[PDB]
Design an enzyme around this catalytic site. Structure first.
Site, mmCIF file in Angstrom:
data_model
loop_
_atom_site.group_PDB
_atom_site.id
_atom_site.type_symbol
_atom_site.label_atom_id
_atom_site.label_comp_id
_atom_site.label_asym_id
_atom_site.label_seq_id
_atom_site.Cartn_x
_atom_site.Cartn_y
_atom_site.Cartn_z
ATOM 1 N N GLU B 25 17.292 14.516 -9.758
ATOM 2 C CA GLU B 25 17.003 14.028 -8.414
ATOM 3 C C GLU B 25 16.618 12.552 -8.431
ATOM 4 O O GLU B 25 17.288 11.717 -7.815
ATOM 5 C CB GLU B 25 15.892 14.863 -7.775
ATOM 6 C CG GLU B 25 14.867 15.401 -8.758
ATOM 7 C CD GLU B 25 13.930 16.408 -8.125
ATOM 8 O OE1 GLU B 25 13.629 16.266 -6.922
ATOM 9 O OE2 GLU B 25 13.492 17.340 -8.830
ATOM 10 N N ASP B 102 12.656 19.496 -9.934
ATOM 11 C CA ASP B 102 11.259 19.891 -9.891
ATOM 12 C C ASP B 102 11.121 21.296 -9.310
ATOM 13 O O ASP B 102 12.075 21.889 -8.798
ATOM 14 C CB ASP B 102 10.446 18.894 -9.066
ATOM 15 C CG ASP B 102 10.501 17.490 -9.629
ATOM 16 O OD1 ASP B 102 10.722 17.345 -10.850
ATOM 17 O OD2 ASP B 102 10.321 16.530 -8.851
ATOM 18 N N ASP B 104 8.492 22.185 -6.969
ATOM 19 C CA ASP B 104 7.426 21.999 -5.989
ATOM 20 C C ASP B 104 8.007 21.882 -4.585
ATOM 21 O O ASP B 104 7.669 20.981 -3.815
ATOM 22 C CB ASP B 104 6.583 20.775 -6.332
ATOM 23 C CG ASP B 104 5.263 20.748 -5.588
ATOM 24 O OD1 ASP B 104 4.708 21.834 -5.319
ATOM 25 O OD2 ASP B 104 4.781 19.641 -5.270
ATOM 26 N N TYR B 363 -12.749 -0.801 8.857
ATOM 27 C CA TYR B 363 -13.917 -1.152 9.657
ATOM 28 C C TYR B 363 -14.588 0.065 10.287
ATOM 29 O O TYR B 363 -15.790 0.275 10.098
ATOM 30 C CB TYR B 363 -13.518 -2.156 10.742
ATOM 31 C CG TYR B 363 -12.844 -3.392 10.199
ATOM 32 C CD1 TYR B 363 -13.423 -4.130 9.175
ATOM 33 C CD2 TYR B 363 -11.626 -3.822 10.707
ATOM 34 C CE1 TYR B 363 -12.810 -5.259 8.674
ATOM 35 C CE2 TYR B 363 -11.005 -4.950 10.211
ATOM 36 C CZ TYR B 363 -11.601 -5.665 9.195
ATOM 37 O OH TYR B 363 -10.985 -6.790 8.700
#
Lengths: 755, 755
Positions: B25, B102, B104, B363
């Site tokens: 992939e 993979d 997942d 902030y």
């Protein structure tokens, strides 16, 4: 114009002089201004949309920008007016334009400075007579518990002076408001109660004009000269004068805010020359030290990045944090880290893609290279470094001072255009020999090295490192060149590239070869059968092409025909621009002077650690003598908790027991030497009043006496460690050098895995 | 030609059938494959570039896909020809294509399922007889520190079955390898030693073409119907057969991984109907509870996001996490959260921009409510919810079950198009009345409501909430409409809008009005003089134009002419789509169905919590009685701590002293009833041997008997709390409802600030 403009009711009318235009930086500032203006319509009498309009911000290219076009459209500004006379200024649709920007380096500095530069360049007479104004919000607010009224400081210097004037801040909570969005609703209404007191004017003194040509002009030469000295904080008298008449000279703003913004922007790319790492990488290293201090179990890259953001105040994007973590954990031939600070459990990339083939942060895990980091970045020295403080909270140190110069012995390049920085790692053996000659005092070149230091010339070689390089390093005309290795098989008319030049990605090299049409005129095909760390590029040429290659590409006595044809030569061009520890930018021309500049900092750190250790040992032995002298007469005085712990202090003071500060002598975290020796006394008798009964028996006494003899031996050892022949703390430096060399060798043996 | 294709040496020649192609992939999998394939003189006779090529995976659109075009060019496949015969199958340049992906839900199912669907659609005869194969790398590895060789499980069910035995994990470490990049170098070489047996061939059994059409075809109705049942993991027999024959049927592979991937994609946008939050929001809530369970001090948004990512396994991007945190902390008229779980200090947005005007995460600060959360999400039940385990570590619970159904009393929307979901908050009073009638058993409509829920008809009103809304909510037959309020003055020709419809941003509404060219044929100008929370928009019209609006926009018995002209009506469209607690997708036709579905889950959770409380109280009671009897008659056998060896255990087992798991009983975190009672008596005698001298006399005996009396009183309180007429634990639910209502009232009075 844009829809972000909210017109005032009297804007452009007969009372346009009383109207002001608040230019907020973004959407949050716009919302805060809107909320303040609208809440001022009911409870107080003052600012409102009747006399205050609102707008938002978003040469040769500064005139076509849409935001300045909108501003000049709403304000009614005329380019060819110069607004010299009062009546000319009265034609404006607004009395003044007020910039409401965040106090950080983004709002103040870049954007406020850009607006000031635009106004000065186009209408310089507008800054004078008081037309451009700003909003000075309380930068720091301290709240006293049970008082519900804070005390505000607009500058950090005032807060520092007030804090050092204060006795203690146990019941005081300090809040930093670097951005406008940090103000709460009650805080916002408190500001808008006296909004008229938060408007500051710009004066445009004589010295400002030249500064406007430096920070924002097209002249990029004197700008570097201005930036190469660091930012000096505003003095107390200047702040008092500013607050007196509520006028801010442009010069001061340009020299502080915009200069700090430029320095911050530079520091994000160019690293410090003491540790060879930027602020982000220093944050990553400090977070790794804090996280794996006692556990050192492998953690996912995204998890460690989240930990760093939570604890080290990494407020930038997480993608950059993960990329930098991966870069720090990468170890391969041609990697940017010759001695990575992290062990990467998983696929962290290969030399072929230049580290771009690393796995996703959610799969690959990271760990701290505990041995190498501890040997190179001692835990003892971490306490004495100067630290940066983000919103009053401790963060990563200002700079790290490793046992060996890391800015030299590791590769480094800045991909972001704007400032050139390229470093090629020098040979580890040469660095070790140089530092050992400097510190040993027994090396035959020690005096020669000191002679080379006081007057700048070179006495010991500093060659580029070739640890993970199978090619050749040739020095031609003061320029170093790296040559890859190849073999030629005439029978099959084929070439096998066995080693690319230094720091050359495999896929980048292949595509560079393929792009050149002349090279492909003879190359029939190229495939890449290289291993994970070695290079094996299989190129097949067209028939009878070797002779054509020889006759076309010519050798220059530096590279032969094949290397010139195959681009197997790289030039080691190095740009040695670094960030000064105090803030400035320093441009070196050789690695020798970089090492010569790094040496005194390490020596001074060793001396400081020695004096701090001596003082701590003296304090500890004093308190141990006090506790043992209480112990052997515990049957004579008999007061630890038998009586009330308020009358004891009188009787311990009647005898010789000096007041001491526990948790400061027991474990000084960041106690600087003068403060440590000042506030150690005048504490209390908790070291005697709050001891345990365990100390009553004689075994505790003999443990105490062996402990005190141990620290007395350590104290005499560190006293003789001082006043040494080269400088105090040279032997310990040599031991640390040997330990870090052993750690580096062990890491190199195990591919930086340490089993 | 192909960008990332590394041809095998024998590919396309006389040994093409022996040559295999590995499809990866990303670049990480390609690097792993290159590292594995290049083991020269190590792991002999294994895979290598001699017979293994590499390629990267970077319905008319499928024909022109560049990656698939490169793949077919490499393999020499022919679209028109069907490879049904062996002779025509030998023309391919490679014997088979292997996907190294993979595990997942992205490598498996997403792109592996895509490759399988592509092959099935274009060359279905290839999957049969074996052409598409996969690389089933060990998903889970168990390492023993004294064995240095791991046990590998390719499925989670196998690991769970192994963990049923081998209970201790006393010296075992479990590692999850969801992606290919998670494997270490030694693991990579160990895997490539058995690469020959690591490959699994797909079979394309019957009933797989229909599954392929459902999952990847253009049809969506059957695809949606498939997703209402959740993903069922493979049983032991199927996994055993797959491992024995090394063949994976396509159907099973699809229904196991691509269904799970699609469900995960859906649930990232569609929330559960029990708690009304998605996986990301549930992770955020759990992380907030963990962070502020003790301090509740305000923290910056980015710091809290980093903490959540570090602790709650939030591997997604940080910008999404910060946006979701801000959304959870937002509280304004029209905001998504009517009862936000977070108090936000700063400016978190306004209704004008729909919460998109919030300040930067650096902030603004966030903190836990700690007053509303503790009542809506009890800490007692947090131990009883199922939990999501990611990589073997605990994370946010599978679902939360609040005291009141939060999926029905909060505004919800899906910004990611692809699955419609829209919820309009119901009135708090109606929901409280409904739940109290269902629970209290004293409401005159209690049995009537039970009849209603049995026969799914409605007996109590459920009207939309209008707390922060100054308009009108009107029902015009099986739909609801929200109307804003306006005041129009004919003199001087202005219309001042005072309230916009529900969940309508001010700037978006103004822009929508502006784009309508016909409406501005009469509008001279529009000014936004609204406040932070209330709306006041001035619209100045052209002279003598109101009659034109009267004659142009016609009354429709629902909207006035001015209302239609200003678009002051909003239709409350509802899309009651949620995810089942077990994994499936559920669709509701009314909010009554959602409430009736949520009620049994909450009732069962109260019953289970009371049962576990009774069990743990009985366990604590027997252990306290044992220690009390021991402290009573210890003089008979021994009164000291000298008996710490097995002699004390034997002498206690001689009497009626049972061995109790002191750690489990004193603090059972997630021990459900069955193993709680199973492991209660499998502990040791530490519950007696850990008795300090303080607890060896009467002064602690009085405290012990007072404790046992209090907990016995709690025990029979739990006892007759059960077997209540509506259901056990009705009064506890009623008092929790009262507490949460009081907390909601306090938050509404304090603007969700709680002072």
């Amino acid at each position: 114009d844009v829809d972000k403009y909210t017109r005032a009711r009297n804007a452009g009318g007969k009372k346009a002089q009383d109207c002001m235009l608040l230019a907020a930086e973004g959407d949050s500032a716009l919302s805060l201004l809107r909320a303040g203006l609208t809440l001022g319509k009911s409870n107080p009498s003052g600012p409102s949309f009747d006399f205050c309009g609102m707008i938002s911000l978003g040469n040769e290219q500064l005139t076509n920008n849409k935001v300045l076009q909108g501003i000049v459209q709403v304000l009614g500004l005329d380019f060819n007016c110069h607004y010299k006379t009062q009546e000319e200024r009265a034609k404006l649709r607004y009395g003044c334009i007020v910039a409401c920007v965040d106090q950080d380096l983004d709002g103040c500095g870049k954007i406020l400075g850009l607006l000031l530069a635009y106004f000065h360049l186009f209408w310089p007479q507008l800054i004078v007579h008081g037309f451009v104004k700003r909003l000075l919000t309380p930068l720091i607010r301290v709240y006293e518990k049970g008082n519900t009224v804070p005390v505000e400081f607009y500058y950090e210097q005032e807060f520092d002076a007030w804090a050092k004037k204060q006795t203690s801040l146990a019941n005081h909570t300090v809040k930093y408001y670097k951005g406008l969005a940090a103000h709460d609703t009650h805080e916002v209404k408190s500001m808008f109660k006296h909004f008229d007191k938060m408007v500051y004017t710009f004066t445009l003194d004589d010295s400002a004009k030249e500064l406007f040509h430096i920070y924002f002009g097209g002249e990029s030469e004197l700008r570097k000269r201005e930036l190469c000295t660091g930012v000096v904080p505003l003095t107390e008298t200047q702040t008092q004068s500013i607050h007196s008449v509520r006028r801010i000279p442009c010069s001061l703003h340009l020299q502080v805010d915009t200069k700090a913004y430029k320095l911050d922007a530079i520091e994000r790319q160019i690293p410090n020359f003491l540790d060879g790492m930027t602020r982000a990488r220093r944050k990553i290293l400090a977070g790794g030290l804090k996280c794996f201090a006692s556990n050192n179990r492998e953690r996912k890259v995204f998890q460690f990045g989240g930990y760093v953001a939570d604890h080290m105040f990494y407020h930038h994007g997480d993608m950059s944090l993960n990329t930098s973590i991966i870069k720090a954990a990468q170890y391969y031939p041609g990697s940017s880290h010759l001695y990575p600070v992290f062990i990467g459990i998983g696929s962290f990339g290969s030399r072929h893609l230049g580290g771009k083939d690393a796995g996703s942060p959610r799969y690959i895990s990271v760990q701290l290279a505990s041995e190498f980091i501890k040997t190179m970045f001692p835990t003892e020295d971490s306490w004495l470094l100067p630290y940066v403080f983000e919103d009053g909270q401790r963060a990563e140190p200002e700079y790290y001072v490793p046992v060996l110069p890391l800015a030299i012995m590791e590769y480094g390049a800045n991909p972001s255009e704007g400032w050139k920085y390229t470093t090629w790692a020098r040979q580890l053996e040469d660095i070790l020999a140089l530092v050992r000659a400097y510190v040993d005092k027994n090396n035959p070149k020690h005096e020669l090295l000191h002679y080379a230091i006081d007057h700048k010339i070179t006495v010991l070689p500093l060659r580029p490192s070739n640890y993970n390089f199978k090619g050749h390093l040739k020095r031609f005309g003061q320029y170093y060149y790296s040559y890859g290795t190849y073999v030629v098989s005439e029978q099959r008319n084929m070439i096998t590239i066995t080693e690319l030049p230094l720091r050359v990605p495999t896929v980048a090299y292949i595509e560079s070869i393929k792009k050149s049409s002349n090279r492909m005129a003879f190359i029939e095909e190229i495939v890449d059968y290289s291993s994970s760390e070695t290079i094996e590029i299989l190129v097949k040429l067209k028939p009878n092409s070797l002779s054509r290659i020889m006759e076309e590409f010519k050798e220059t006595e530096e590279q032969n025909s094949i290397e010139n044809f195959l681009r197997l030569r790289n030039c080691l061009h190095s740009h040695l621009n670094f960030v000064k520890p105090k803030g400035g930018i320093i441009e070196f021309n050789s690695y020798y002077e970089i090492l010569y500049a790094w040496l005194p900092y390490r020596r001074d750190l060793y001396q400081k650690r020695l004096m701090r250790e001596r003082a701590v040992l003296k304090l500890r032995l004093i308190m141990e003598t006090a506790i043992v002298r209480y112990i052997n007469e515990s049957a004579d005085l008999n007061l630890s908790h038998y009586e009330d712990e308020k009358e004891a202090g009188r009787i311990l003071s009647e005898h010789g027991f000096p007041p001491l500060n526990q948790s400061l002598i027991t474990s000084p975290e960041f106690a600087t030497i003068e403060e440590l020796n000042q506030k150690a006394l005048q504490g209390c008798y908790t070291y005697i009043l709050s001891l345990q009964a365990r100390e009553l028996l004689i075994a505790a006494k003999t443990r105490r006496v062996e402990k005190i003899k141990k620290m007395q031996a350590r104290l005499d050892k560190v006293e003789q460690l001082l006043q040494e022949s080269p400088f105090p703390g040279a032997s310990v430096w040599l031991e640390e050098i040997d330990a870090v060399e052993k750690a580096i060798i062990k890491g190199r043996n195990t591919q930086w895995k340490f089993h």
